[PDB]
Design a protein around this motif. Structure first.
Motif, PDB file in Angstrom:
ATOM      1  N   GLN A   1     -35.045  42.469   5.988  1.00  0.00           N
ATOM      2  CA  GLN A   1     -34.236  43.631   5.615  1.00  0.00           C
ATOM      3  C   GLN A   1     -35.082  44.694   4.915  1.00  0.00           C
ATOM      4  O   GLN A   1     -35.039  45.882   5.270  1.00  0.00           O
ATOM      5  CB  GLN A   1     -33.073  43.214   4.721  1.00  0.00           C
ATOM      6  CG  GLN A   1     -31.765  43.006   5.446  1.00  0.00           C
ATOM      7  CD  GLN A   1     -30.810  42.148   4.659  1.00  0.00           C
ATOM      8  OE1 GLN A   1     -31.186  41.534   3.664  1.00  0.00           O
ATOM      9  NE2 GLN A   1     -29.557  42.120   5.083  1.00  0.00           N
TER      10      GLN A   1
ATOM     11  N   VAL B   1     -31.363  49.012   1.344  1.00  0.00           N
ATOM     12  CA  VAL B   1     -31.067  48.785   2.756  1.00  0.00           C
ATOM     13  C   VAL B   1     -29.723  49.357   3.187  1.00  0.00           C
ATOM     14  O   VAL B   1     -29.506  49.540   4.397  1.00  0.00           O
ATOM     15  CB  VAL B   1     -31.136  47.278   3.093  1.00  0.00           C
ATOM     16  CG1 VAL B   1     -31.048  47.027   4.594  1.00  0.00           C
ATOM     17  CG2 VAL B   1     -32.401  46.669   2.513  1.00  0.00           C
TER      18      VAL B   1
ATOM     19  N   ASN C   1     -28.097  40.248   6.660  1.00  0.00           N
ATOM     20  CA  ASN C   1     -28.032  40.671   8.051  1.00  0.00           C
ATOM     21  C   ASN C   1     -29.178  40.040   8.828  1.00  0.00           C
ATOM     22  O   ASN C   1     -30.286  39.897   8.306  1.00  0.00           O
ATOM     23  CB  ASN C   1     -28.090  42.199   8.164  1.00  0.00           C
ATOM     24  CG  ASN C   1     -27.618  42.703   9.509  1.00  0.00           C
ATOM     25  OD1 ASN C   1     -27.148  41.933  10.344  1.00  0.00           O
ATOM     26  ND2 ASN C   1     -27.738  44.007   9.727  1.00  0.00           N
TER      27      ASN C   1
END
Ligand SMILES: *[C@@H]1O[C@H](CO[C@@H]2O[C@@H](C)[C@@H](O)[C@@H](O)[C@@H]2O)[C@@H](O[C@@H]2O[C@H](CO)[C@@H](O)[C@H](O)[C@H]2NC(C)=O)[C@H](O)[C@H]1NC(C)=O
Ligand SMILES: *[C@@H]1O[C@H](CO[C@@H]2O[C@@H](C)[C@@H](O)[C@@H](O)[C@@H]2O)[C@@H](O[C@@H]2O[C@H](CO)[C@@H](O)[C@H](O)[C@H]2NC(C)=O)[C@H](O)[C@H]1NC(C)=O
Ligand SMILES: *[C@@H]1O[C@H](CO)[C@@H](O[C@@H]2O[C@H](CO)[C@@H](O)[C@H](O)[C@H]2NC(C)=O)[C@H](O)[C@H]1NC(C)=O
Ligand SMILES: *[C@@H]1O[C@H](CO)[C@@H](O)[C@H](O)[C@H]1NC(C)=O
Ligand SMILES: *[C@@H]1O[C@H](CO)[C@@H](O)[C@H](O)[C@H]1NC(C)=O
Ligand SMILES: *[C@@H]1O[C@H](CO)[C@@H](O)[C@H](O)[C@H]1NC(C)=O
Lengths: 214, 218, 598
Positions: free
Chosen positions: C508, C558, C564
């Motif tokens: 990320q 982010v 994610n």
């Protein structure tokens, strides 16, 4: 802002009676509460500091209770040295606020006032002012109504009264009403009267005089 | 023993300034929050101002916010209150009280004697002594009128203090003119009028006024 | 305004911080003097300082417990109060607490001292390090590897089983007594956020997110597994079924936590030369001074501050020699009072270059939150420090940086095959560990929750092995064994999900900083050097420490409130397509029923 409404405002009781003073907070103030006693002309002295904890050197007849939003101070049996004014104080959230106070008075038998009248001195008239005083001596209860009547015309806003503290011997009040006028206004009128109505009187007592007569 | 003391009380003009001092002794000053508490004459009490321990965060109430400033020097064990833009409503006795520590729920417990802060535009004025002559039911009343004086206090006695029965000295009142007016009366048997001597003694330390007025029957 | 409780807590926290700074500095200084010069005086001073610090901390905890949390409206003081009020072990009675400490020390000792002896030569005996690790790393003999695996397990785990049983029961008693559901809930509590509207986070949301993300990771791992299975079939003919799971003792280390050591056996194009720049560094007469100067220049080039003169004056950057023995494990020391040092016995190798970049990233993290109050000087959560170090090392490893610094020839041609080599070597390490980590923590959570009875611990362990990781035991194990406890982290009471979370966080962060740096090509070629914008964007998060919630800190960089997986998949997309093409005629998946025994 926490707002404290104390009840009652005044209270009279005899020795031995159970006296209960209440202090209410509009919101919760946890256990940060304190009750203070104040004799006339002296400094407040703490009696209870955690809503219920007695202060060292304070007789056990004093006791405190309650929590949350409602609080109660209680004196188990009254004593001569217990006649004073009591304040509640919260110190939880800023700012801090006191109660309005509660004056604990002596209860006695009804007594009617002795009425006296004193004309202005002639010397004071040379000074440029005149004061007529009507005195109410040794009455009880404190509720009394004084009316000034000049030539059958009701007077308003030209007199001031002050009442004494509870007498040490007979627990009776004394009141003085002093009206101040100029020489001009003093010589404009004839009859000066002070009419007192009190619980101890069946009918109003009027004492009067006429300007410059004997 | 802890013996909080106060000083700095005097007379100031409206709009003037004044700096109160409260000297603390007998305890570890640097570890207790201190507070100021006033009493208007004949009214209740209010929380004037409050400070924290390490003299940092200072709290105030909406009434005297931005006018007063609390401060402390932990070196000299002294607490200060700086008051500017004073108004007639600030007339009160001011006490400095100890407050919370760091853990317990203990609170105000040691207070000083107070100091009197009067704010008025009057300067000093000596009084005037007006006789109240008798013309009433076994006992008769007589008195003396102390008028147009400022400031407090005045001490009133009768016959050098040898006459105490039936004496009633009334609390002073503040007339419009910004001056104080007080009255003192005494009741006496009507058989003593031309026989006894009745002396009104008035002493006013701030104005250095000593007056002995003779009251006589007419 | 505020309440009278708050102000008291504020004064208490000021006093506590000012008293604790000096004690922590003395303890840290003592431990440094010990770790760089092992003598008895130093160890005695270290233990004295540590006991003093622990006693002070327990005193301040018992004192701070008297301020009622519920009445505090200031978030920073609330966090510090919560940190101080943690009972910890104190809620246990004295005798059971003594027994718990005894069993902890017993497990640690028996792990750190266990030896297995070769039956063929009973005078030769080896411990785990370095013998068993060297054998499991370099041996190509099936029978020898199986002997090592089974001897280590059947020796140490049999002893470890009952100690771990009592450890479980006592830890569950403790955790339940401190108003938690179980010890696993206690561990998951590290990620909890409670009080900020729109940023809250429960302890079960962690399980939900971890499972949801492993679901998306599954296909890449399946294809990598198929490829490795084929290559191992090529390596051990007639021993591996083309449809079965991989035997657990052929994975490259003692447990299979990393498949790193299979690169020599699985390299796609061994014809190309490997980008090992060690010889260039050696021929230019580089030393540790030059290495750390280059790392410092890298970090300064992106807008971060220099190191302090105290760092250069007090750190120990070389082996002191034979007269003075020291601990050579690379460590980043935050001694307090602005004193920062690094202890590492650096060799002149590319790996030590990369680890110097990593450790200096750690030190920069520590420097950035130095102005925070004491109890707030820590990473947002347990994964942030390692993520920062790892993104530093990723940026430093790109060939563009190596060329620009002058250790690689300017005429080095970047074909499409060196990139596939690099991505495969990265994948063997980074994605190979995720199913292992997830399965280990799932097993621990289930055991603590009481969903797996004691009489089928190993049954469920190997069922989960098969189903999730695709690995099968070479010989059957009954309930006498305790194979999970044969790993260091399990027998030493350390949480494990931090590595999964950090693996996702690092990509990320890399995506965010390369998007900020206006990078255009494939992500794995991105070098954030000379990007003051990326430096500022990273510092804005570094400076927070643990003052603000970790969700807000992650969003600051982010733009997302949760973990994610698409950054990782985008990092590995070229390798993903290459495997998808390479596996056209291969079976993808595995049957859970085939076993190397019958
Ligand atoms: C929360 O309170 C702080 C002040 O408390 C200080 O920090 C605490 C965490 C604890 O260590 C206390 O003992 C400390 O005294 C507030 O920070 C102050 O803010 C004011 C106003 O801007 C400023 O004058 C001060 O410099 C700040 N304090 C310090 C130490 O710098 C903070 O604002 C409070 N939180 C919120 C949301 O308002
Ligand atoms: C954390 O522990 C406190 C206190 O625990 C006690 O003291 C410890 C040092 C240890 O000896 C424990 O075994 C003791 O039981 C808990 O505070 C108690 O809370 C309950 C209910 O809220 C209350 O009835 C008790 O009087 C409290 N005890 C004290 C000393 O105040 C606290 O609940 C525990 N859990 C937390 C903080 O999450
Ligand atoms: C960041 O930019 C600087 C620009 O000054 C780069 O430094 C130059 O790098 C080239 C590459 O070969 C050298 O030829 C120059 O001599 C360097 N100049 C100076 C003043 O050092 C620097 O290399 C860039 N960062 C990276 C990582 O390449
Ligand atoms: C290590 O400790 C020994 C024993 O006290 C001492 O003689 C020596 O000087 C120390 N070395 C360093 C580098 O401090
Ligand atoms: C940082 O260190 C470099 C190294 O030479 C130096 O040139 C520069 O002036 C330093 N900058 C600061 C702000 O100290
Ligand atoms: C690299 O390019 C060559 C020639 O263009 C091609 O044959 C080969 O498939 C490419 N390799 C990869 C991994 O795409």
């Amino acid at each position: 802002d926490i707002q404290m409404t104390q009840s009652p405002s005044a209270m009279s009781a005899s020795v031995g009676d159970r006296v209960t003073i209440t202090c209410r907070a509009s919101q919760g103030i946890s256990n940060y509460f304190a009750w203070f006693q104040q004799k006339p002309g002296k400094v407040p002295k703490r009696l209870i500091y955690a809503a219920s904890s007695l202060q060292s050197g304070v007789p056990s007849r004093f006791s405190g209770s309650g929590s949350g939003t409602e609080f109660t101070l209680t004196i188990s049996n009254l004593q001569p040295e217990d006649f004073a004014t009591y304040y509640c104080l919260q110190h939880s959230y800023y700012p801090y606020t006191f109660g309005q106070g509660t004056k604990l008075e002596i209860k006695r038998t009804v007594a009617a006032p002795s009425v006296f009248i004193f004309p202005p001195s002639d010397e004071q008239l040379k000074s440029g002012t005149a004061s007529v005083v009507c005195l109410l001596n040794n009455f009880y209860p404190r509720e009394a109504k004084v009316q000034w009547k000049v030539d059958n015309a009701l007077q308003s806003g030209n007199s001031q009264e002050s009442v004494t503290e509870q007498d040490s011997k007979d627990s009776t009040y004394s009141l003085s009403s002093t009206l101040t006028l100029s020489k001009a206004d003093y010589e404009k009128h004839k009859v000066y009267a002070c009419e007192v109505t009190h619980q101890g009187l069946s009918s109003p007592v009027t004492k009067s005089f006429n300007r410059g007569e004997c | 023993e802890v013996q909080l003391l106060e000083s700095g009380g005097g007379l100031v003009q409206p709009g003037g300034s004044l700096r109160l001092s409260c000297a603390a002794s007998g305890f570890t000053f640097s570890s207790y929050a201190m507070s100021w508490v006033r009493q208007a004459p004949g009214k209740g009490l209010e929380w004037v101002s409050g400070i924290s321990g390490s003299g940092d965060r200072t709290y105030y109430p909406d009434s005297v916010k931005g006018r007063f400033t609390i401060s402390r020097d932990n070196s000299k064990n002294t607490l200060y209150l700086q008051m500017n833009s004073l108004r007639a409503e600030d007339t009160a006795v001011y006490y400095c009280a100890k407050d919370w520590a760091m853990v317990g729920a203990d609170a105000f417990d040691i207070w000083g004697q107070g100091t009197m802060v009067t704010v008025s535009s009057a300067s000093t004025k000596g009084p005037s002594v007006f006789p109240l002559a008798p013309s009433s039911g076994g006992t008769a009343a007589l008195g003396c009128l102390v008028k147009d004086y400022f400031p407090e206090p005045v001490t009133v006695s009768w016959n050098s203090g040898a006459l105490t029965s039936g004496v009633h000295t009334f609390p002073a009142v503040l007339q419009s003119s910004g001056l104080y007016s007080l009255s003192s009366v005494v009741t006496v048997p009507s058989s003593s009028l031309g026989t006894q001597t009745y002396i009104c003694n008035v002493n006013h330390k701030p104005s250095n006024t000593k007056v002995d007025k003779k009251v006589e029957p007419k | 305004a505020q309440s009278t409780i708050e102000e008291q807590a504020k004064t208490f926290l000021d006093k506590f911080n000012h008293e604790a700074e000096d004690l922590f500095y003395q303890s840290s200084l003592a431990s440094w003097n010990y770790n760089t010069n092992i003598t008895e005086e130093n160890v005695q001073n270290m233990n004295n300082a540590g006991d003093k610090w622990s006693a002070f901390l327990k005193e301040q905890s018992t004192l701070a417990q008297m301020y009622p949390l519920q009445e505090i409206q200031n978030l920073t003081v609330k966090l510090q109060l919560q940190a101080l009020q943690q009972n910890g072990s104190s809620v246990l009675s004295e005798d059971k607490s003594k027994r718990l400490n005894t069993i902890l020390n017993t497990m640690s000792t028996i792990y750190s001292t266990g030896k297995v002896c070769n039956p063929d030569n009973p005078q030769e005996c080896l411990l785990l390090e370095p013998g068993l690790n060297e054998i499991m790393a370099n041996s190509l003999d099936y029978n020898e590897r199986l002997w090592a695996w089974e001897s280590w397990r059947s020796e140490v785990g049999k002893q470890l089983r009952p100690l771990y049983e009592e450890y479980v029961v006592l830890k569950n008693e403790m955790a339940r007594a401190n108003h938690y559901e179980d010890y696993g809930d206690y561990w998951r509590g590290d990620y909890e956020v409670n009080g900020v509207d729109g940023y809250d986070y429960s302890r079960g949301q962690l399980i939900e997110d971890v499972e949801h993300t492993f679901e998306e990771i599954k296909p890449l791992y399946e294809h990598l597994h198929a490829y490795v299975r084929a290559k191992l079939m090529n390596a051990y003919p007639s021993y591996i079924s083309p449809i079965g799971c991989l035997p657990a003792h052929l994975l490259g280390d003692m447990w299979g936590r990393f498949w790193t050591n299979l690169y020599s056996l699985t390299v796609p194009f061994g014809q190309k030369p490997n980008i090992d720049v060690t010889d260039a560094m050696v021929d230019q007469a580089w030393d540790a001074q030059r290495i750390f100067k280059e790392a410092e220049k890298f970090f300064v080039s992106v807008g971060l501050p220099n190191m302090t003169q105290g760092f250069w004056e007090n750190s120990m950057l070389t082996d002191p020699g034979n007269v003075q023995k020291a601990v050579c494990h690379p460590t980043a020391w935050d001694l307090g009072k602005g004193d920062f040092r690094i202890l590492m016995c650096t060799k002149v190798t590319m790996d030590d270059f990369l680890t110097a970049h990593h450790e200096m990233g750690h030190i920069q993290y520590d420097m950035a939150y130095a102005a925070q109050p004491f109890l707030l000087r820590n990473g947002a959560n347990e994964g942030f420090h390692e993520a920062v170090g790892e993104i530093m090392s990723l940026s430093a490893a790109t060939p563009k940086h190596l060329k620009s610094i002058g250790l690689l020839s300017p005429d080095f041609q970047e074909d499409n095959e060196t990139e596939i080599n690099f991505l495969l070597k990265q994948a063997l390490t980074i994605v190979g560990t995720l199913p292992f980590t997830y399965m280990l923590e799932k097993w621990r959570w289930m055991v603590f929750k009481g969903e797996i009875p004691k009489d089928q611990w190993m049954k469920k362990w190997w069922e989960m092995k098969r189903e999730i990781v695709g690995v099968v035991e070479p010989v059957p194990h009954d309930e006498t064994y305790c194979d999970p406890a044969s790993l260091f982290h399990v027998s030493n009471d350390y949480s494990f999900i931090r590595y999964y979370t950090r693996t996702l966080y690092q990509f990320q962060f890399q995506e965010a900083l390369c998007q900020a740096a206006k990078h255009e090509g494939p992500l794995h070629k991105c070098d954030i050097s000379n990007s003051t914008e990326a430096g500022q964007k990273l510092f804005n998060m570094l400076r927070l420490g643990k003052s603000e919630p970790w969700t807000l800190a992650l969003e600051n960089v982010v733009g997302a409130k949760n973990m994610n997986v698409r950054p990782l998949l985008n990092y590995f997309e070229p390798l993903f397509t290459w495997l998808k093409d390479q596996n056209k005629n291969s079976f993808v998946g595995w049957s859970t029923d085939w076993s190397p025994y019958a």
